[PDB]
Amino acid sequence: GSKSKKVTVGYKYYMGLFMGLFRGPVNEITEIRVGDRTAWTGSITGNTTIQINKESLFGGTKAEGGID
Amino acid sequence: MWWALAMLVASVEVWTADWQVLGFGNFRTKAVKAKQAKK
Amino acid sequence: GLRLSWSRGCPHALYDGQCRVNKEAFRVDATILTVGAGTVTAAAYATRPDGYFAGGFIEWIDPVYGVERRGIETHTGNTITIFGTVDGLAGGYILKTYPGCPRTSAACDTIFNNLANFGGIPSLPDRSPFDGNPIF
Amino acid sequence: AGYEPNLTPAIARRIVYEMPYVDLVQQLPDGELNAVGPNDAFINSQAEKPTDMSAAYDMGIMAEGESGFDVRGNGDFGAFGSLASDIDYLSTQIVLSEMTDMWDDVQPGFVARIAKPVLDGQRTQMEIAEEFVRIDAINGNVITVARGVLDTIPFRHQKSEMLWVTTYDGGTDWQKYAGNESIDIKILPWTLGGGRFPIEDAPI
Ligand SMILES: [Fe+3]
């Protein structure tokens, strides 16, 4: 046996996805939710890039889930 | 109320019916109508 | 009302405001060599491969109707077939004839070079769900 | 407004001290309890739960030579009690308040550790009143316990102090830190939907 630095863990998934929301450029996209929980907020007004980083919303090395 | 004017042909408003599907079933919040696809 | 409807092929009508394929880049026209029963023959059509006009339409000017546009259902060699009827045709005025399209991603890419303006999604992920069965 | 949906983490009262031999005996399996040489030491602490939605607390340790408070080892929020009677050395009937939710989970004869405010000069445990008291029987808010049971001579206290029960509870990384290897630590509470407290903004 050994401490959690080298042990079996709850397993991450590694692959992303692609979602078709709806037609037509919109003035701004505000907020993104996961599982009926307010995950990320921000006004996107055009072709751009961001990162969702609050994996704490569901868990991690001590709990399940968490988008990132 | 244009329903009220539509029923101007009546013989005088209770109703009992099921629905023909509309754009209610939710998977993307819309604070404004951007329309949507249909798949 | 049903327009967008994600699919393996774009629902855009060829030459529409969204497919945006140039109206002039794909011109074809020729006077009728011989009219026939629901079919037309012309020299220009022979220069094209089979099915080049599948879903296309023919155009000319009628002394009264002015502009007249009606579709094509099949092409082969010098011969074509029309979805609609023939209102009478004469081997005078040229039939401004437009090619159709299979409407597939490969079709819009190869023939039209319009892949960058395509509305069909090839990688519709077979509706790989996130419920019911193990995945990801 | 959603009828109190907030569950984010927040700071809370905490206390730390060197792990005593009783802690090793209680938490260390006897198979490896032997061979724990005299140069070994263990870290332990306790803290109160700030919110109901809080689950446990992670321990951030930044020992000598370490860069940043490494997150290793976690503990469960033990029951807490606020001394308010200025008990003396020989006092046995402990009159206190702040009956935490888990304050009634201690069985008769349990062991609890008393303490007082800690700061520069007060950090030393030789003089600071750190006394282990064995709780005999609860009397509602007041609890009956013994004074100076295991590794501390009985001492006096003042009202508004803090009392912590540590029987079968605590938090440590199980690292045999050598003596004189003083380290700086910060305990971070965590919640389900809020995760851990501020990454490193917690006190030390
Ligand atoms: Fe096209």
Side-chain angles (χ1 to χ4, degrees), chain A, chain B, chain C, chain D residues 1-2 5 9-10 12 20 29 31 35 37-38 41 47 50 55-56 60 63 65 68 73 75 78-79 81 84 108-109 112 115 117 121 129 137 140 146 148 154 170-171 178-179 189 193-195 198 202-203:
Chain A
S2 192
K3 309 295 283 185
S4 196
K5 77 205 163 288
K6 169 220 75 187
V7 191
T8 188
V9 300
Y11 294 97
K12 60 198 167 68
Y13 193 65
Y14 52 76
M15 211 75 228
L17 53 80
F18 169 87
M19 294 177 71
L21 302 190
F22 50 85
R23 183 67 180 174
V26 295
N27 276 71
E28 71 275 50
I29 297 161
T30 61
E31 195 278 331
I32 304 170
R33 301 196 181 150
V34 190
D36 186 74
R37 180 164 281 163
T38 288
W40 174 90
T41 178
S43 182
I44 284 163
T45 55
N47 295 340
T48 193
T49 303
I50 54 165
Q51 69 276 17
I52 297 168
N53 223 28
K54 190 187 178 178
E55 72 306 350
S56 289
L57 77 164
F58 299 134
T61 197
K62 295 290 169 176
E64 72 188 32
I67 306 311
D68 179 17
Chain B
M1 67 67 76
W2 171 268
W3 70 268
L5 183 63
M7 310 303 324
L8 183 58
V9 308
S11 58
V12 177
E13 313 290 25
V14 293
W15 259 99
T16 50
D18 57 357
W19 292 271
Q20 199 262 339
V21 305
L22 60 85
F24 164 41
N26 189 359
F27 283 92
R28 293 100 172 161
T29 315
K30 264 162 61 183
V32 173
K33 69 100 174 173
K35 301 297 181 181
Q36 193 254 320
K38 182 178 74 71
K39 178 67 175 67
Chain C
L2 288 65
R3 157 47 42 77
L4 183 59
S5 187
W6 317 120
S7 44
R8 277 184 155 244
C10 84
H12 291 326
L14 281 291
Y15 314 91
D16 72 349
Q18 299 299 320
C19 189
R20 293 158 41 71
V21 291
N22 174 270
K23 175 73 161 173
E24 190 277 331
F26 274 12
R27 291 176 59 186
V28 182
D29 56 356
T31 293
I32 300 92
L33 286 173
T34 297
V35 183
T39 46
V40 178
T41 63
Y45 304 168
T47 71
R48 307 292 98 170
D50 186 74
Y52 171 47
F53 284 100
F57 73 94
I58 56 172
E59 169 62 43
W60 84 100
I61 303 92
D62 190 356
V64 290
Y65 291 153
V67 55
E68 277 290 327
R69 60 183 184 172
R70 299 203 290 100
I72 307 155
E73 197 173 325
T74 294
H75 160 258
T76 298
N78 64 7
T79 298
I80 59 168
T81 315
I82 54 164
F83 184 11
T85 186
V86 297
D87 67 313
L89 298 168
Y93 44 70
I94 62 170
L95 291 184
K96 176 76 181 70
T97 304
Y98 297 72
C101 182
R103 314 141 281 191
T104 63
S105 57
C108 201
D109 186 0
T110 57
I111 298 173
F112 284 93
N113 187 255
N114 193 68
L115 179 56
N117 283 5
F118 190 63
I121 313 297
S123 80
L124 180 58
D126 305 332
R127 275 279 147 160
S128 58
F130 297 132
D131 286 327
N133 263 7
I135 196 162
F136 278 9

PDB file of all heavy atoms in Angstrom, chain D residues 143-186, unseen atoms left out:
ATOM      1  N   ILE D 143     -20.414  19.464  31.027  1.00  0.00           N
ATOM      2  CA  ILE D 143     -19.882  18.123  30.821  1.00  0.00           C
ATOM      3  C   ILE D 143     -18.874  17.825  31.921  1.00  0.00           C
ATOM      4  O   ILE D 143     -18.068  18.687  32.289  1.00  0.00           O
ATOM      5  N   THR D 144     -18.923  16.604  32.447  1.00  0.00           N
ATOM      6  CA  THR D 144     -17.997  16.166  33.482  1.00  0.00           C
ATOM      7  C   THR D 144     -16.840  15.418  32.835  1.00  0.00           C
ATOM      8  O   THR D 144     -17.053  14.493  32.044  1.00  0.00           O
ATOM      9  N   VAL D 145     -15.614  15.824  33.169  1.00  0.00           N
ATOM     10  CA  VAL D 145     -14.403  15.238  32.605  1.00  0.00           C
ATOM     11  C   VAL D 145     -13.293  15.317  33.647  1.00  0.00           C
ATOM     12  O   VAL D 145     -13.449  15.917  34.712  1.00  0.00           O
ATOM     13  N   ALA D 146     -12.160  14.699  33.330  1.00  0.00           N
ATOM     14  CA  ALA D 146     -10.983  14.705  34.185  1.00  0.00           C
ATOM     15  C   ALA D 146      -9.976  15.727  33.672  1.00  0.00           C
ATOM     16  O   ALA D 146     -10.102  16.254  32.563  1.00  0.00           O
ATOM     17  N   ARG D 147      -8.970  16.003  34.498  1.00  0.00           N
ATOM     18  CA  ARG D 147      -7.941  16.987  34.189  1.00  0.00           C
ATOM     19  C   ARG D 147      -6.577  16.314  34.145  1.00  0.00           C
ATOM     20  O   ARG D 147      -6.251  15.490  35.006  1.00  0.00           O
ATOM     21  N   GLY D 148      -5.782  16.673  33.140  1.00  0.00           N
ATOM     22  CA  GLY D 148      -4.435  16.150  33.009  1.00  0.00           C
ATOM     23  C   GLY D 148      -4.378  14.638  32.969  1.00  0.00           C
ATOM     24  O   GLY D 148      -3.893  14.003  33.912  1.00  0.00           O
ATOM     25  N   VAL D 149      -4.869  14.049  31.886  1.00  0.00           N
ATOM     26  CA  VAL D 149      -5.032  12.601  31.783  1.00  0.00           C
ATOM     27  C   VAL D 149      -3.800  11.921  31.196  1.00  0.00           C
ATOM     28  O   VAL D 149      -3.254  10.994  31.793  1.00  0.00           O
ATOM     29  N   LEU D 150      -3.341  12.366  30.027  1.00  0.00           N
ATOM     30  CA  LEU D 150      -2.358  11.607  29.261  1.00  0.00           C
ATOM     31  C   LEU D 150      -0.993  12.272  29.173  1.00  0.00           C
ATOM     32  O   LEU D 150       0.007  11.667  29.578  1.00  0.00           O
ATOM     33  N   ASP D 151      -0.915  13.501  28.651  1.00  0.00           N
ATOM     34  CA  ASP D 151       0.384  14.101  28.370  1.00  0.00           C
ATOM     35  C   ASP D 151       0.466  15.576  28.749  1.00  0.00           C
ATOM     36  O   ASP D 151       1.286  16.306  28.179  1.00  0.00           O
ATOM     37  N   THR D 152      -0.357  16.038  29.687  1.00  0.00           N
ATOM     38  CA  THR D 152      -0.315  17.431  30.113  1.00  0.00           C
ATOM     39  C   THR D 152      -0.787  17.510  31.555  1.00  0.00           C
ATOM     40  O   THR D 152      -1.810  16.917  31.906  1.00  0.00           O
ATOM     41  N   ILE D 153      -0.037  18.230  32.385  1.00  0.00           N
ATOM     42  CA  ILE D 153      -0.483  18.426  33.768  1.00  0.00           C
ATOM     43  C   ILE D 153      -1.733  19.296  33.760  1.00  0.00           C
ATOM     44  O   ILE D 153      -1.847  20.207  32.914  1.00  0.00           O
ATOM     45  N   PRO D 154      -2.695  19.075  34.652  1.00  0.00           N
ATOM     46  CA  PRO D 154      -3.899  19.913  34.648  1.00  0.00           C
ATOM     47  C   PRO D 154      -3.548  21.374  34.882  1.00  0.00           C
ATOM     48  O   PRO D 154      -2.625  21.703  35.629  1.00  0.00           O
ATOM     49  N   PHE D 155      -4.298  22.256  34.222  1.00  0.00           N
ATOM     50  CA  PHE D 155      -4.068  23.690  34.343  1.00  0.00           C
ATOM     51  C   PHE D 155      -5.381  24.449  34.483  1.00  0.00           C
ATOM     52  O   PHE D 155      -6.457  23.842  34.507  1.00  0.00           O
ATOM     53  N   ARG D 156      -5.301  25.772  34.572  1.00  0.00           N
ATOM     54  CA  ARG D 156      -6.467  26.632  34.692  1.00  0.00           C
ATOM     55  C   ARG D 156      -6.805  27.234  33.336  1.00  0.00           C
ATOM     56  O   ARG D 156      -6.009  27.195  32.395  1.00  0.00           O
ATOM     57  N   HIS D 157      -8.010  27.794  33.244  1.00  0.00           N
ATOM     58  CA  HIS D 157      -8.495  28.385  32.006  1.00  0.00           C
ATOM     59  C   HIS D 157      -9.331  29.616  32.324  1.00  0.00           C
ATOM     60  O   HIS D 157      -9.631  29.912  33.483  1.00  0.00           O
ATOM     61  N   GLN D 158      -9.706  30.335  31.269  1.00  0.00           N
ATOM     62  CA  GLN D 158     -10.541  31.520  31.375  1.00  0.00           C
ATOM     63  C   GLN D 158     -11.735  31.370  30.443  1.00  0.00           C
ATOM     64  O   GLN D 158     -11.684  30.645  29.447  1.00  0.00           O
ATOM     65  N   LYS D 159     -12.817  32.066  30.782  1.00  0.00           N
ATOM     66  CA  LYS D 159     -14.031  31.985  29.987  1.00  0.00           C
ATOM     67  C   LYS D 159     -13.744  32.389  28.540  1.00  0.00           C
ATOM     68  O   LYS D 159     -12.739  33.032  28.227  1.00  0.00           O
ATOM     69  N   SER D 160     -14.650  31.994  27.648  1.00  0.00           N
ATOM     70  CA  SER D 160     -14.561  32.255  26.216  1.00  0.00           C
ATOM     71  C   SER D 160     -13.455  31.477  25.522  1.00  0.00           C
ATOM     72  O   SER D 160     -13.161  31.744  24.350  1.00  0.00           O
ATOM     73  N   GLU D 161     -12.830  30.521  26.204  1.00  0.00           N
ATOM     74  CA  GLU D 161     -11.773  29.719  25.604  1.00  0.00           C
ATOM     75  C   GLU D 161     -12.388  28.689  24.659  1.00  0.00           C
ATOM     76  O   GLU D 161     -13.594  28.689  24.399  1.00  0.00           O
ATOM     77  N   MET D 162     -11.558  27.794  24.130  1.00  0.00           N
ATOM     78  CA  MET D 162     -11.996  26.755  23.209  1.00  0.00           C
ATOM     79  C   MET D 162     -11.644  25.386  23.774  1.00  0.00           C
ATOM     80  O   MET D 162     -10.550  25.187  24.312  1.00  0.00           O
ATOM     81  N   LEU D 163     -12.580  24.447  23.650  1.00  0.00           N
ATOM     82  CA  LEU D 163     -12.379  23.067  24.066  1.00  0.00           C
ATOM     83  C   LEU D 163     -12.679  22.158  22.884  1.00  0.00           C
ATOM     84  O   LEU D 163     -13.722  22.293  22.238  1.00  0.00           O
ATOM     85  N   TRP D 164     -11.763  21.232  22.607  1.00  0.00           N
ATOM     86  CA  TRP D 164     -11.864  20.354  21.447  1.00  0.00           C
ATOM     87  C   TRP D 164     -11.742  18.908  21.899  1.00  0.00           C
ATOM     88  O   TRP D 164     -10.803  18.556  22.619  1.00  0.00           O
ATOM     89  N   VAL D 165     -12.690  18.077  21.477  1.00  0.00           N
ATOM     90  CA  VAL D 165     -12.627  16.636  21.689  1.00  0.00           C
ATOM     91  C   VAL D 165     -11.931  16.013  20.487  1.00  0.00           C
ATOM     92  O   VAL D 165     -12.234  16.346  19.336  1.00  0.00           O
ATOM     93  N   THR D 166     -10.992  15.099  20.752  1.00  0.00           N
ATOM     94  CA  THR D 166     -10.187  14.519  19.684  1.00  0.00           C
ATOM     95  C   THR D 166     -10.183  12.996  19.676  1.00  0.00           C
ATOM     96  O   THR D 166      -9.358  12.402  18.971  1.00  0.00           O
ATOM     97  N   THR D 167     -11.069  12.345  20.426  1.00  0.00           N
ATOM     98  CA  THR D 167     -11.109  10.889  20.439  1.00  0.00           C
ATOM     99  C   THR D 167     -11.540  10.370  19.072  1.00  0.00           C
ATOM    100  O   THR D 167     -12.667  10.614  18.632  1.00  0.00           O
ATOM    101  N   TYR D 168     -10.639   9.651  18.404  1.00  0.00           N
ATOM    102  CA  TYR D 168     -10.871   9.057  17.092  1.00  0.00           C
ATOM    103  C   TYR D 168     -11.094  10.080  15.988  1.00  0.00           C
ATOM    104  O   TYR D 168     -11.605   9.722  14.918  1.00  0.00           O
ATOM    105  N   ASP D 169     -10.729  11.340  16.208  1.00  0.00           N
ATOM    106  CA  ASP D 169     -10.930  12.397  15.229  1.00  0.00           C
ATOM    107  C   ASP D 169      -9.673  13.250  15.129  1.00  0.00           C
ATOM    108  O   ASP D 169      -8.880  13.340  16.070  1.00  0.00           O
ATOM    109  N   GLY D 170      -9.504  13.875  13.976  1.00  0.00           N
ATOM    110  CA  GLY D 170      -8.359  14.722  13.725  1.00  0.00           C
ATOM    111  C   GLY D 170      -8.030  14.737  12.247  1.00  0.00           C
ATOM    112  O   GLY D 170      -8.796  14.260  11.415  1.00  0.00           O
ATOM    113  N   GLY D 171      -6.866  15.304  11.938  1.00  0.00           N
ATOM    114  CA  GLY D 171      -6.393  15.358  10.569  1.00  0.00           C
ATOM    115  C   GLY D 171      -4.890  15.514  10.476  1.00  0.00           C
ATOM    116  O   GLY D 171      -4.312  16.406  11.103  1.00  0.00           O
ATOM    117  N   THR D 172      -4.248  14.652   9.693  1.00  0.00           N
ATOM    118  CA  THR D 172      -2.802  14.699   9.531  1.00  0.00           C
ATOM    119  C   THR D 172      -2.427  13.948   8.263  1.00  0.00           C
ATOM    120  O   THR D 172      -3.208  13.152   7.737  1.00  0.00           O
ATOM    121  N   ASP D 173      -1.214  14.212   7.782  1.00  0.00           N
ATOM    122  CA  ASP D 173      -0.707  13.576   6.575  1.00  0.00           C
ATOM    123  C   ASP D 173       0.006  12.258   6.843  1.00  0.00           C
ATOM    124  O   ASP D 173       0.410  11.586   5.887  1.00  0.00           O
ATOM    125  N   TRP D 174       0.167  11.870   8.108  1.00  0.00           N
ATOM    126  CA  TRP D 174       0.860  10.633   8.460  1.00  0.00           C
ATOM    127  C   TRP D 174       2.310  10.643   7.980  1.00  0.00           C
ATOM    128  O   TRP D 174       2.835   9.635   7.505  1.00  0.00           O
ATOM    129  N   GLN D 175       2.962  11.796   8.106  1.00  0.00           N
ATOM    130  CA  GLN D 175       4.362  11.964   7.734  1.00  0.00           C
ATOM    131  C   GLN D 175       5.186  12.044   9.011  1.00  0.00           C
ATOM    132  O   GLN D 175       4.909  12.877   9.880  1.00  0.00           O
ATOM    133  N   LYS D 176       6.196  11.179   9.120  1.00  0.00           N
ATOM    134  CA  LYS D 176       7.043  11.117  10.311  1.00  0.00           C
ATOM    135  C   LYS D 176       8.044  12.273  10.287  1.00  0.00           C
ATOM    136  O   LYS D 176       9.258  12.098  10.159  1.00  0.00           O
ATOM    137  N   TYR D 177       7.505  13.483  10.412  1.00  0.00           N
ATOM    138  CA  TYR D 177       8.347  14.670  10.443  1.00  0.00           C
ATOM    139  C   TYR D 177       9.263  14.627  11.660  1.00  0.00           C
ATOM    140  O   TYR D 177       8.827  14.347  12.779  1.00  0.00           O
ATOM    141  N   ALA D 178      10.542  14.909  11.434  1.00  0.00           N
ATOM    142  CA  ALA D 178      11.521  14.873  12.506  1.00  0.00           C
ATOM    143  C   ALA D 178      11.359  16.083  13.423  1.00  0.00           C
ATOM    144  O   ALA D 178      10.823  17.125  13.037  1.00  0.00           O
ATOM    145  N   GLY D 179      11.834  15.929  14.656  1.00  0.00           N
ATOM    146  CA  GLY D 179      11.786  17.031  15.596  1.00  0.00           C
ATOM    147  C   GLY D 179      12.598  18.215  15.108  1.00  0.00           C
ATOM    148  O   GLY D 179      13.607  18.068  14.417  1.00  0.00           O
ATOM    149  N   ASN D 180      12.143  19.410  15.478  1.00  0.00           N
ATOM    150  CA  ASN D 180      12.715  20.684  15.062  1.00  0.00           C
ATOM    151  C   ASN D 180      12.362  21.065  13.632  1.00  0.00           C
ATOM    152  O   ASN D 180      12.740  22.155  13.185  1.00  0.00           O
ATOM    153  N   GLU D 181      11.652  20.209  12.895  1.00  0.00           N
ATOM    154  CA  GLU D 181      11.236  20.515  11.528  1.00  0.00           C
ATOM    155  C   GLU D 181       9.908  21.276  11.531  1.00  0.00           C
ATOM    156  O   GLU D 181       8.880  20.810  11.041  1.00  0.00           O
ATOM    157  N   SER D 182       9.950  22.474  12.110  1.00  0.00           N
ATOM    158  CA  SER D 182       8.758  23.306  12.189  1.00  0.00           C
ATOM    159  C   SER D 182       8.234  23.609  10.792  1.00  0.00           C
ATOM    160  O   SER D 182       9.000  23.882   9.862  1.00  0.00           O
ATOM    161  N   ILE D 183       6.909  23.555  10.646  1.00  0.00           N
ATOM    162  CA  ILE D 183       6.250  23.791   9.369  1.00  0.00           C
ATOM    163  C   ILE D 183       5.062  24.718   9.585  1.00  0.00           C
ATOM    164  O   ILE D 183       4.536  24.848  10.692  1.00  0.00           O
ATOM    165  N   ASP D 184       4.644  25.365   8.500  1.00  0.00           N
ATOM    166  CA  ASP D 184       3.488  26.252   8.496  1.00  0.00           C
ATOM    167  C   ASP D 184       2.357  25.550   7.762  1.00  0.00           C
ATOM    168  O   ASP D 184       2.561  25.019   6.665  1.00  0.00           O
ATOM    169  N   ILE D 185       1.171  25.550   8.365  1.00  0.00           N
ATOM    170  CA  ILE D 185       0.039  24.791   7.851  1.00  0.00           C
ATOM    171  C   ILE D 185      -1.182  25.694   7.743  1.00  0.00           C
ATOM    172  O   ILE D 185      -1.278  26.730   8.409  1.00  0.00           O
ATOM    173  N   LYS D 186      -2.118  25.289   6.888  1.00  0.00           N
ATOM    174  CA  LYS D 186      -3.381  26.001   6.719  1.00  0.00           C
ATOM    175  C   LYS D 186      -4.446  24.970   6.381  1.00  0.00           C
ATOM    176  O   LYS D 186      -4.301  24.227   5.407  1.00  0.00           O
TER     177      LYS D 186
END
